[PDB]
Structure 1
Amino acid sequence: GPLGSMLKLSELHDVFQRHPELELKYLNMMKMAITGKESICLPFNFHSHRQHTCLDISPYGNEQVSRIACTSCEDNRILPTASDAMVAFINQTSNIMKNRNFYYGFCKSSELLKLSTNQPPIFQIYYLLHAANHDIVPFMHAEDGRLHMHVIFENPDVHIPCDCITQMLTAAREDYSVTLNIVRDHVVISVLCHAVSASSVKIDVTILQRKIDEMDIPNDVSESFERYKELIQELCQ
């Protein structure tokens, strides 16, 4: 308190000579970050994203935060990679219920679905976001035979972890653009496909399409999704 409020580090050096044992102790101690935050201007395109920086959307500010300074994140936890996301894309038909939420976004359209099986980064990006934040709702739409996606965050306070983004950009690179934006107080990540490159894998469209048709859409899901579909249509136009 009283010493702490008064001493500058230019005065501690003659003191650390007498006590070199306490220097390391002093150095390690200073680990509570105060800086590493900055505002972000919407719509926030992810080419503007600063490397190794989480995003924090909240009533207390839409701001990017450095990973060392980030306290909402959890040091112990391991988030998947774009490669894990690809493996998940490959094994879709084994995890239909897990990924129920992703399939609802197609709104029972088999054309939009067939496009997804030619465009892995769509599933990948969903998979990657979902692992970070389970409370998201994707909506799929197509233009010129290219699948695009909008991912709505259900909650108003949204924290996008740093490594979740790094992986996103890996799955999205060159062909896609990603933009974060708020609409009607909700966060919406927009993934735009510029070009459909060749996929070197082939997902069994039939067993996927047929198994998706069989699923029932719950009324909680239906009514919640019903609310959100409008929100996107208002941001588009």
Structure 2
Amino acid sequence: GKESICLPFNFHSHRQHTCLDISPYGNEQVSRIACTSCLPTASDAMVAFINQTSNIMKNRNFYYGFCKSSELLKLSTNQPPIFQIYYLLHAANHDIVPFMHAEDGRLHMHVIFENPDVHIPCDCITQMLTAAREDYSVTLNIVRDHVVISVLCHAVSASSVKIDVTILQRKIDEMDIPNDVSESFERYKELIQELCQ
């Protein structure tokens, strides 16, 4: 590929018009023009955030990461970028497992990639950066031989929209958790502990 990157990779290091390519052979950034592997905008993802309660099942993979915590879910409703960043990553890569964690009164998200080969399209990165601007760090690392994108919130700025929290909590409480989703969290128990600590 075109150029090695150092891990952990903070997305503030993103070179315009490049994709990230992670494989067992190395960690690289490549020209989007030259990329053989190569989506919604941050605005689209904000509309989806606004419309969450109309799309609970559609966004079920997101809500599993809360592990039925009403407290975490409430925090998410004050922080659109958590949902926005998941939504963007999910569009480019379905084989992901997000886990949410609160620290210092703020919600943070770790997105665990199931497969060892991971391509992050340029168009995904640029939209994540829009969603993350100022108040979040977004970093890619390999942790326990898994690619993980960590979304850490430094400050929670006022959101100028309100979600119906009660409706959202009720729908999340009612969701079934499939066996394979519970199993994946158990698989990743040591990984999740490392990320959170």
CA distance 1:179–1:132, change in 2 (3 Å): same
CA distance 1:144–1:234, change in 2 (3 Å): closer
**1:149-164 matched pairs, under 5 angstroms:** 149-164=109-124
Report if the CA contact (8 A) 2:101-2:196 is conserved.
no
- Show CA shifts across 1:121-173 (max 9, x none): 00000000000001101110111211011000011100000000000000000
Report if the CA contact (8 A) 1:175-1:193 is conserved.
yes
Count residues with an aligned counterpart: 197
CA distance 1:209–1:236, change in 2 (3 Å): closer
Q: Secondary structure at the match of 1:68?
A: coil
Report if the CA contact (8 A) 1:139-1:229 is conserved.
no
Aligned partners of 1:201, 1:230: CA distance in 2, in Å? Answer: 36
Unaligned runs of 5+ in 1: 1-35, 74-78
1:61 deviation in Å? Answer: 1.3
- Show CA shifts across 1:69-128 (max 9, x none): 10111xxxxx00000000000111111111111111111110000000000000000000
CA distance 1:236–1:118, change in 2 (3 Å): closer
Rg comparison, structure with higher value: 1
Report if the CA contact (8 A) 1:44-1:181 is conserved.
yes
Q: Secondary structure at the match of 1:62?
A: strand
CA distance 1:229–1:86, change in 2 (3 Å): farther
Report if the CA contact (8 A) 1:45-1:178 is conserved.
yes
Would you tell me which structure has more strand in proportion to its own residues? 2
Aligned partners of 2:177, 2:25: CA distance in 1, in Å? Answer: 36
Report if the CA contact (8 A) 2:96-2:114 is conserved.
yes
Aligned partners of 1:108, 1:149: CA distance in 2, in Å? Answer: 15
- Show CA shifts across 1:10-66 (max 9, x none): xxxxxxxxxxxxxxxxxxxxxxxxxx7110111111111111110000012110001
Quote the RMSD (CA, aligned, Å): 1.0
> Taking structure 1 as the reference length, what is the TM-score of the superposition?
0.81
> RCO higher in 1 or 2 (8 Å CA, sep ≥ 6)?
2
* Structure-2 residue corresponding to 1:91: 51
Aligned partners of 1:231, 1:51: CA distance in 2, in Å? Answer: 31
Report if the CA contact (8 A) 1:151-1:189 is conserved.
yes
Unaligned runs of 5+ in 2: none
- Out of 139, 144, 166, the residue aligned to residue 179 of structure 1 is 139
CA distance 1:236–1:113, change in 2 (3 Å): closer
1:236 deviation in Å? Answer: 4.3
* Structure-1 residue corresponding to 2:12: 47
Aligned partners of 2:175, 2:196: CA distance in 1, in Å? Answer: 29
Aligned partners of 1:57, 1:229: CA distance in 2, in Å? Answer: 23
Q: Secondary structure at the match of 1:156?
A: coil
Q: Secondary structure at the match of 2:167?
A: helix
1:235 deviation in Å? Answer: 3.7
> Taking structure 2 as the reference length, what is the TM-score of the superposition?
0.97
